[PDB]
Design an enzyme around this catalytic site. Sequence first.
Site, PDB file in Angstrom:
ATOM      1  N   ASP A 177      63.133  75.235  -9.666  1.00  0.00           N
ATOM      2  CA  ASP A 177      62.291  76.289  -9.732  1.00  0.00           C
ATOM      3  C   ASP A 177      60.979  76.505  -8.894  1.00  0.00           C
ATOM      4  OD1 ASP A 177      64.854  76.664 -11.171  1.00  0.00           O
ATOM      5  OD2 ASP A 177      63.637  76.525 -13.020  1.00  0.00           O
ATOM      6  N   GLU A 178      61.056  75.559  -8.019  1.00  0.00           N
ATOM      7  CA  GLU A 178      59.586  75.467  -7.194  1.00  0.00           C
ATOM      8  C   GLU A 178      59.464  76.417  -6.030  1.00  0.00           C
ATOM      9  OE1 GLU A 178      61.899  72.872  -7.253  1.00  0.00           O
ATOM     10  OE2 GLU A 178      61.347  71.007  -8.220  1.00  0.00           O
ATOM     11  N   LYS A 180      62.718  76.829  -3.718  1.00  0.00           N
ATOM     12  CA  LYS A 180      63.521  76.094  -2.449  1.00  0.00           C
ATOM     13  C   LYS A 180      63.952  77.189  -1.663  1.00  0.00           C
ATOM     14  CE  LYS A 180      64.683  74.094  -5.898  1.00  0.00           C
ATOM     15  NZ  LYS A 180      64.998  73.770  -7.027  1.00  0.00           N
ATOM     16  N   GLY A 187      69.695  78.322  -9.219  1.00  0.00           N
ATOM     17  CA  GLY A 187      69.311  79.858  -8.944  1.00  0.00           C
ATOM     18  C   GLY A 187      68.135  80.060  -8.171  1.00  0.00           C
ATOM     19  N   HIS A 188      68.341  80.876  -7.284  1.00  0.00           N
ATOM     20  CA  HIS A 188      67.177  81.200  -6.156  1.00  0.00           C
ATOM     21  C   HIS A 188      67.006  82.722  -6.004  1.00  0.00           C
ATOM     22  CE1 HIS A 188      68.655  77.065  -5.449  1.00  0.00           C
ATOM     23  NE2 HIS A 188      69.516  77.451  -4.880  1.00  0.00           N
ATOM     24  N   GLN A 237      67.990  71.988  -7.996  1.00  0.00           N
ATOM     25  CA  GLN A 237      67.220  71.441  -9.276  1.00  0.00           C
ATOM     26  C   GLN A 237      66.018  70.777  -8.704  1.00  0.00           C
ATOM     27  OE1 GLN A 237      71.290  70.736  -9.710  1.00  0.00           O
ATOM     28  NE2 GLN A 237      70.622  72.958 -10.302  1.00  0.00           N
ATOM     29  N   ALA A 283      66.640  81.824 -13.421  1.00  0.00           N
ATOM     30  CA  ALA A 283      67.426  82.786 -12.554  1.00  0.00           C
ATOM     31  C   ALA A 283      69.041  82.641 -12.844  1.00  0.00           C
ATOM     32  CB  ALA A 283      66.983  82.549 -11.136  1.00  0.00           C
ATOM     33  N   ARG A 298      66.596  82.422 -19.387  1.00  0.00           N
ATOM     34  CA  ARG A 298      65.699  81.634 -20.171  1.00  0.00           C
ATOM     35  C   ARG A 298      64.421  81.708 -19.962  1.00  0.00           C
ATOM     36  NH1 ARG A 298      68.324  75.874 -21.453  1.00  0.00           N
ATOM     37  NH2 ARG A 298      68.822  76.195 -18.906  1.00  0.00           N
ATOM     38  N   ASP A 318      49.098  81.491  -5.460  1.00  0.00           N
ATOM     39  CA  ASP A 318      48.597  82.934  -5.896  1.00  0.00           C
ATOM     40  C   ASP A 318      48.712  83.236  -7.200  1.00  0.00           C
ATOM     41  OD1 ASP A 318      51.824  83.032  -4.787  1.00  0.00           O
ATOM     42  OD2 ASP A 318      51.424  84.972  -6.175  1.00  0.00           O
TER      43      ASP A 318
HETATM   44  N1  LIG Z   1      54.009  84.700  -6.532  1.00  0.00           N
HETATM   45  C1  LIG Z   1      55.364  83.811  -6.079  1.00  0.00           C
HETATM   46  N2  LIG Z   1      56.450  84.125  -6.784  1.00  0.00           N
HETATM   47  C2  LIG Z   1      57.059  83.136  -5.656  1.00  0.00           C
HETATM   48  C3  LIG Z   1      56.583  82.431  -4.484  1.00  0.00           C
HETATM   49  N3  LIG Z   1      57.872  81.723  -3.931  1.00  0.00           N
HETATM   50  C4  LIG Z   1      58.698  81.895  -4.614  1.00  0.00           C
HETATM   51  N4  LIG Z   1      58.537  82.952  -5.633  1.00  0.00           N
HETATM   52  C5  LIG Z   1      59.330  83.702  -6.421  1.00  0.00           C
HETATM   53  O1  LIG Z   1      59.176  82.580  -7.775  1.00  0.00           O
HETATM   54  C6  LIG Z   1      60.595  82.144  -7.965  1.00  0.00           C
HETATM   55  C7  LIG Z   1      60.874  80.782  -7.427  1.00  0.00           C
HETATM   56  O2  LIG Z   1      62.003  80.253  -8.495  1.00  0.00           O
HETATM   57  P1  LIG Z   1      63.428  79.849  -8.150  1.00  0.00           P
HETATM   58  O3  LIG Z   1      63.966  81.325  -7.444  1.00  0.00           O
HETATM   59  O4  LIG Z   1      64.200  79.399  -9.322  1.00  0.00           O
HETATM   60  O5  LIG Z   1      63.171  78.681  -6.989  1.00  0.00           O
HETATM   61  P2  LIG Z   1      64.374  77.831  -6.479  1.00  0.00           P
HETATM   62  O6  LIG Z   1      65.282  77.440  -7.478  1.00  0.00           O
HETATM   63  O7  LIG Z   1      63.703  76.514  -6.100  1.00  0.00           O
HETATM   64  O8  LIG Z   1      64.836  78.350  -5.183  1.00  0.00           O
HETATM   65  C8  LIG Z   1      61.585  83.222  -7.448  1.00  0.00           C
HETATM   66  O9  LIG Z   1      61.758  84.352  -8.378  1.00  0.00           O
HETATM   67  C9  LIG Z   1      60.901  83.621  -6.244  1.00  0.00           C
HETATM   68  O10 LIG Z   1      61.322  84.931  -5.826  1.00  0.00           O
HETATM   69  C10 LIG Z   1      55.140  82.522  -4.090  1.00  0.00           C
HETATM   70  O11 LIG Z   1      54.830  81.796  -3.213  1.00  0.00           O
HETATM   71  N5  LIG Z   1      54.506  83.382  -5.137  1.00  0.00           N
HETATM   72  O1  LIG Z   2      68.821  74.752 -10.937  1.00  0.00           O
HETATM   73  C1  LIG Z   2      68.275  74.410 -12.121  1.00  0.00           C
HETATM   74  N1  LIG Z   2      66.966  74.886 -12.201  1.00  0.00           N
HETATM   75  C2  LIG Z   2      66.105  74.620 -13.511  1.00  0.00           C
HETATM   76  N2  LIG Z   2      66.650  73.648 -14.151  1.00  0.00           N
HETATM   77  C3  LIG Z   2      68.069  73.315 -14.156  1.00  0.00           C
HETATM   78  C4  LIG Z   2      68.729  73.874 -12.979  1.00  0.00           C
HETATM   79  N3  LIG Z   2      70.053  73.162 -13.287  1.00  0.00           N
HETATM   80  C5  LIG Z   2      70.076  72.731 -14.596  1.00  0.00           C
HETATM   81  N4  LIG Z   2      68.820  72.691 -14.834  1.00  0.00           N
HETATM   82  C6  LIG Z   2      68.368  71.920 -16.191  1.00  0.00           C
HETATM   83  O2  LIG Z   2      69.227  70.621 -16.041  1.00  0.00           O
HETATM   84  C7  LIG Z   2      69.546  70.194 -17.461  1.00  0.00           C
HETATM   85  C8  LIG Z   2      70.903  69.929 -17.684  1.00  0.00           C
HETATM   86  O3  LIG Z   2      71.819  71.124 -17.098  1.00  0.00           O
HETATM   87  P1  LIG Z   2      73.062  70.993 -16.422  1.00  0.00           P
HETATM   88  O4  LIG Z   2      72.927  70.751 -15.267  1.00  0.00           O
HETATM   89  O5  LIG Z   2      73.498  72.742 -16.869  1.00  0.00           O
HETATM   90  O6  LIG Z   2      74.331  70.497 -16.996  1.00  0.00           O
HETATM   91  C9  LIG Z   2      68.958  71.282 -18.396  1.00  0.00           C
HETATM   92  O7  LIG Z   2      67.704  71.077 -18.623  1.00  0.00           O
HETATM   93  C10 LIG Z   2      68.908  72.597 -17.411  1.00  0.00           C
HETATM   94  O8  LIG Z   2      68.235  73.509 -17.907  1.00  0.00           O
HETATM   95  O1  LIG Z   3      67.088  78.603 -11.170  1.00  0.00           O
HETATM   96  C1  LIG Z   3      67.263  78.070 -12.116  1.00  0.00           C
HETATM   97  N1  LIG Z   3      67.135  78.173 -13.531  1.00  0.00           N
HETATM   98  O2  LIG Z   3      65.467  78.243 -13.725  1.00  0.00           O
HETATM   99  C2  LIG Z   3      67.868  77.614 -14.638  1.00  0.00           C
HETATM  100  C3  LIG Z   3      68.099  78.269 -15.806  1.00  0.00           C
HETATM  101  O3  LIG Z   3      68.184  79.530 -15.503  1.00  0.00           O
HETATM  102  O4  LIG Z   3      68.415  77.722 -17.005  1.00  0.00           O
HETATM  103 MG   LIG Z   4      65.951  78.112  -9.419  1.00  0.00          MG
END
Ligand SMILES: Nc1nc2c(ncn2[C@@H]2O[C@H](COP(=O)(O)OP(=O)(O)O)[C@@H](O)[C@H]2O)c(=O)[nH]1
Ligand SMILES: O=c1[nH]cnc2c1ncn2[C@@H]1O[C@H](COP(=O)(O)O)[C@@H](O)[C@H]1O
Ligand SMILES: O=CN(O)CC(=O)O
Ligand SMILES: [Mg+2]
Length: 431
Positions: free
Chosen positions: A13-14, A16, A40-41, A224, A299, A303, A333
């Site tokens: 969730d950084e 990617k 989830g992205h 992840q 996403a 949660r 930001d």
């Molecule tokens: N404010 C802000 N939101 C961002 C930035 N980059 C991404 N986001 C949003 O922050 C979240 C990143 O979480 P996630 O989507 O799960 O990242 P991923 O799983 O690594 O692709 C997403 O909801 C993006 O739409 C950023 O530079 N600033």
């Molecule tokens: O894509 C992801 N983003 C953030 N946390 C994740 C993601 N996939 C799994 N987790 C975490 O990884 C652990 C194991 O979950 P699992 O991969 O569903 O079997 C739990 O802490 C989940 O919340």
């Molecule tokens: O983008 C992945 N999520 O943050 C993991 C979740 O929904 O538990």
């Molecule tokens: Mg994600």
Amino acid sequence: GNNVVVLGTQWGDEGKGKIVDLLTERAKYVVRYQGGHNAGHTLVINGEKTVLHLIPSGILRENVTSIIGNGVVLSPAALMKEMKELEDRGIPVRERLLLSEACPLILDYHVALDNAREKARGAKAIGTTGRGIGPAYEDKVARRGLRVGDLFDKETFAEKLKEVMEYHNFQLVNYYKAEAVDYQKVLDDTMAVADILTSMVVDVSDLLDQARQRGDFVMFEGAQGTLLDIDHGTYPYVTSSNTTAGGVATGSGLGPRYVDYVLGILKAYSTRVGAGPFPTELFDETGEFLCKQGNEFGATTGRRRRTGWLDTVAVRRAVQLNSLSGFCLTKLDVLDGLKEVKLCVAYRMPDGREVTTTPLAADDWKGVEPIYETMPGWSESTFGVKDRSGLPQAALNYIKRIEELTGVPIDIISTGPDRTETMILRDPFDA
Ligand SMILES: Nc1nc2c(ncn2[C@@H]2O[C@H](COP(=O)(O)OP(=O)(O)O)[C@@H](O)[C@H]2O)c(=O)[nH]1
Ligand SMILES: O=c1[nH]cnc2c1ncn2[C@@H]1O[C@H](COP(=O)(O)O)[C@@H](O)[C@H]1O
Ligand SMILES: O=CN(O)CC(=O)O
Ligand SMILES: [Mg+2]
């Protein structure tokens, strides 16, 4: 370099998705190498939002061919769901997506088992995404799991599936006392989409070898994060695949010597979803602030994510494990308005020692306390800034500091969720 890897350096969730979508403008291929629909992205183009899970984050670009390597655990249902979603929106998945015949399949009984086992664990439940990832990886490794290649012979697949399901159903009802998962239902559901699935199958190893020799720009996309790695993460509160850069070769078939640049996606603060150690976790107002300002909700499961300060001790573990070439600092930001920002620089072990290295298994993290460096924050808005000059000196200092503490240059800076709200100081491809 040609082959660039993009993975999470914290707990996923950084950011990617966005970064891969942005960078793939010059790429020919994009490869998912581990995970499943647990990821989830959110990509955002001119305000239009796209949430992906199993499909690679380079699917919105026609010049790019998206591949999901053998390292990925593939859910027929999940893929189809995302396919129709993307298709109705004008994105022709079938035409830009290729998949591996080696990919293990995630069928309904895996989700049943995942839920069962998670319930059994009780208080020490992992907090998994509930998508059957763990069980899928299990059958694979055991050598009883089904892969995409099986679907090519509908007869024997039905046969193979019949026995594996008997196997799981026995423990599901007897041991777990849970309801059985109907075979015929799984066979019909799966058979309903087999022809579509099999049409995207390609020999991805050989393909990437060919692309390599041609000099084609390729981008590997990780799901992840590092600390969720099956071997190197905070075991057992991890996902069941190698999220670290070494998963690229095992998960795609490309020879490891062909990784030119590993770009680490680093979020300006930390988040974690699910159970497990989180040294810098904030339960105070700042945590609420961070969660709120960064709309930190999973996403995939919805949660609310646990939040905290940037952990340089933990990030430094990602550096060495992944052989990071550079960092992409995301969400700078989100820190706008904070009086002060802190970064963890060392850990205070439960016995008194000050150490700058990370414990391995979750148990050994138990009394570990964080030691911070406190820097002044900034009031100026950095949102949408595409040039360093628009960044206050504090922010620039915060940046220099992170680089100093890690030894890795922050090559890209993201100031907003939209593709364009980014600063590329050095392009992984031509660097
Ligand atoms: N404010 C802000 N939101 C961002 C930035 N980059 C991404 N986001 C949003 O922050 C979240 C990143 O979480 P996630 O989507 O799960 O990242 P991923 O799983 O690594 O692709 C997403 O909801 C993006 O739409 C950023 O530079 N600033
Ligand atoms: O894509 C992801 N983003 C953030 N946390 C994740 C993601 N996939 C799994 N987790 C975490 O990884 C652990 C194991 O979950 P699992 O991969 O569903 O079997 C739990 O802490 C989940 O919340
Ligand atoms: O983008 C992945 N999520 O943050 C993991 C979740 O929904 O538990
Ligand atoms: Mg994600």
